[PDB]
Symmetry: C11
Subunit: 64 residues, 11 copies
């Protein structure tokens, strides 16, 4: 039941949900925030683009 | 069973629930306490807002 | 099983419960009244319109709404 | 399984349980203490009157 | 599965289980450790008592 | 699944399990570790005793 | 749903009594250590004798 | 369901006894036993000179 | 229900999910993967230069 | 679901799993075993010179 | 549902899953995040590696 907070630091950030071809994409624009939870459908989440990301394990910056 | 607190810092903030499911408009100063359902995998916030989660605070910045 | 504490700072604060789907169970609160609202299955989101002090597991926050 | 502690600071404090009409009211007199637990029947609890309230989220005072 | 500790500071303190009704008299210095059942949604304390809960201590006055 | 520790400070301390459904006498210096069952909603302590719970210590007089 | 007590006997003939009738007695000699867990069978545990007792709630000494 | 004790034998012939509802195991000086509580096993008695760690801190058994 | 955060410090970092070796996933410099353990996936191997966060602290994989 | 970390400080350290029954497992100097408790396995005995980490802190088994 | 983080400090580190069954080779600098399955009671690490567990860090000094 865990989640990640992703804040987009540029336009056209891509938050990709995975299972095994990559199955749910979600575009985010500069300053928008996504709170993404892990479903059963969704094993992994990839972030392409400049974003600030918070997880139970601390913060991290994607420099895609 | 976790939730997010969202306080709108301008009018017309948009709190979008993702499965193309559920939009919810918020006006400046209004507070939404949104919980994750089974229906709702992700929540997107478009607009200037202050957000609290289990993982600390964060600010969404509307263009 | 989590809850929010809402104290109304003016009369006519509105604590709106939202369904699993739009604006549903409304509940008016008057200046100084305190509501302890728990999330049900029926209730996915809670909106607060009006001047209120709110406590959640995630700390305090103040609603400055209409 | 969580609960609230309510101490009445005046007579005729009203502790109202909500399902959604005014299902269960409970009067409290100055100095009396109620330890109220959330049931399935009970989604929300309203406190009308001057009272000192303790929850998992800290203390708060209701002002009648 | 949570409980409250109640110590009576005078005689004839009343610990009421919750319209629903199990009453329990306590005398000065007696201690009750009351747990919440399914039967019991709320507990009222009438009388002067010292009360400990998960949420800290509190004193009932009369 | 929670429990209380009770140490008797005098003879003839009475540890009563409720819904007087089970009484249990304790003598000066004896220690009882009482757990809550489904059978047992409340526990009353009559007598001089030192009591430890999850919520800290307390003395019955 | 699964807690235990540590009991160290400070004299010979310490008695660790399991309750429900007075179900199960267990003698302890000076310096022996018993780690007793609560079963469904066992609601309460009585210690008679001089012993050092550790519980989740801290230490306590039984006196004779 | 699932807690354990660490027992280090400080002499030879330490006895770690498992007790049933209402199993002996010998330990020689310097051997370590990590014993978990089963359903079969309500209580554990230690006879002999040993160093014992539990969730509740350390304790020494004095044969 | 636990997860690892992997940030790629060079191009062509390989995040391999293990059953054999069943699921590979390439990551390019600066991309972030939040990988959760499934039932299908017992182990995860990281090949390449990466910064990794787990419940157990941080660690760097050295390509 | 708990586990012990055992690092062997000499050759031929013996990590014995108990229920009755005994799965033995030899460890050579500097090898590390992360042993989890199964239902099959009530107790674990360590014979030999080893460094042991458990939820309850560290402890050294003395050969 | 617990896991271990293993970083290989030399080539040819061996991460062995037990019930000598599932072996998994690791090369210098590669990282494995291994979870305990039902199939897998114990994990042995042979070779020079840095290991993180819920119980802190430890270094294997191996084959």
């Amino acid at each position: 039941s865990d989640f990640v907070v992703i804040k987009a630091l540029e336009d056209g950030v891509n938050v990709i949900g995975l299972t095994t071809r990559f199955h749910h994409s979600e575009k985010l624009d500069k300053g928008e925030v996504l709170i993404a939870q892990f479903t059963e459908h969704t094993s992994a989440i990839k972030v392409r683009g400049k974003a600030y990301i918070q997880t139970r394990h601390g913060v991290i910056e994607s420099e895609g």
